[PDB]
Amino acid sequence: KPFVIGIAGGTASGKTTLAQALARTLGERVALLPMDHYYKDLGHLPLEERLRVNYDHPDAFDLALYLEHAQALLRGLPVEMPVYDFRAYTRSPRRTPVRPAPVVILEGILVLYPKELRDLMDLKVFVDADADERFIRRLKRDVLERGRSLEGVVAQYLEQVKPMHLHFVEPTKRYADVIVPRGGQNPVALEMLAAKALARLAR
Amino acid sequence: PKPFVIGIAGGTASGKTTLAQALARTLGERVALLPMDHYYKDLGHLPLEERLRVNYDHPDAFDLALYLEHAQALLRGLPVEMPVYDFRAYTRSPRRTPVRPAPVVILEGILVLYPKELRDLMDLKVFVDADADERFIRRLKRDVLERGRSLEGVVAQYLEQVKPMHLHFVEPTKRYADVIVPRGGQNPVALEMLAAKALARLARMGAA
C-alpha cells in the first residue's frame, strides 16, 4: 500500500513546482499524477466551443479516468496518463506512461474536492498564495507557454478562474492537514514532506 | 550537538498551545516547552488600575530579554526557572516552573515569530491558523472559565486590544512560517508529521 499525498492549491499557487520538487527529490520512489492533464476529451467539439468551456469547474475534469488511474497505481499497476495540450485546447492522442511507486502524488487545483480522492489520501496538502501573486504567475505562464494574450487571460480569469477558485478550490483548504506557503521556494517544507513520504518506507 | 528548535505561533486561542503541548507529550522527556505568554514583564510594583490598562498583545508588554536568555540557556544545556504569569491577578506570580535542557526545544506564543532574535534560533517555524470568529469563541470560553473574566470584559479587551494587535503584529508573522497548521487542536496528521520530523532530527544527533 503506497503512501498517497494530495497537493491542492489555486492555479499558479506553487502546487505544481512543489509537487515536482518532491518528485525530483524522491526520484524513482514517486509516481506523480497531475490532475490538470485529466481534462475531459472534448476533441469532438468545435474550437470556439472549447474556448468557452469553464476549465475551473469540477465538471470539466475526467474524474473517472483520474480515479481509475490513482487506484491502478495503488494496486501496483502502470497507467497511460493523458497529456492535455493547452495551446490546442485538446487531449493529445499520445499518452505518457507512469510507473507504480511506493509514494503516489495526486496534484491539481481540485484534487481535494471529491470525497473519492480524499479517501485515498494519507496526507492532504494545500499550497496557499494570495490571488494577486497567483494571477501574476498565471499571466506569465499563460502568455509564455499556453499561447494566450493578456486580454484573454484577464477575461478568462475574471469570468471563470477567480469565481470557480472561490466557490470550489479555496473551500477545499478546510480538508488540508497542512498548508504550505511559498510553494515554489520553501526548502523546509519540501524537506519535511520528503521525509514524511519516506515514513511508510521506513514503516 | 545543537538542539532542534521549533517555533509555534498563532493568534490567541488558535490551537498553538494545544498543538505545542501535544507535540511535547508525544516526544516525552526529549522536549522542553517554553510558552512565551508566561513571560510578560513583571509590573507587580504598579497598582492594579495600571496593570489593567496594559495592552498584553503589543510586543512591548513582553519580557523578551528574559525569554531570549532562557531560550539561549536551554540551548547551552543549562536549566531554567520559568516564570508563571497569573492571568486572574494581572501580574507575574511567585510560582516558577523548572525546565530541564532537552534535545528539542519548542518556543510557543502569539508573538514568537515577531523578533528576529527569536526566529534566528529556530530550525522550523510553524504558524497555527484559525478564523477570528472561531478563535474568539475559544478565547471567550478560556477567559471566563480560567482567567476570571466576564463576557463584557472579554469583548472589550478583544475589540480594543487583542484584535487590532493581532492584525498589526501577529497575523503578519505568518509570512515567516515554513508550514501553516489548520485545526491545531484536532489535527493528528500535522501532529504526527511534526513529531516525526523531530524524531528524525533526534536520530541524527545520535548517529555519526
Ligand SMILES: Nc1ccn([C@@H]2O[C@H](COP(=O)(O)O)[C@@H](O)[C@H]2O)c(=O)n1
Ligand atoms: N483549455 C484549458 C484548460 C485548462 N486551463 C487552465 O488550466 C488551469 C490550471 O493549470 P495548472 O494550473 O497547470 O493546473 C486551470 O485554472 C484552467 O483555467 C486553460 O486555461 N485552458
Ligand SMILES: Nc1ccn([C@@H]2O[C@H](COP(=O)(O)O)[C@@H](O)[C@H]2O)c(=O)n1
Ligand atoms: N494580564 C493579561 C495578560 C495576557 N492576557 C492575554 O494572554 C493572551 C494569550 O494567552 P495564550 O493565548 O494563553 O498566550 C493574549 O492574547 C493577552 O490578551 C490577558 O488577557 N491578560
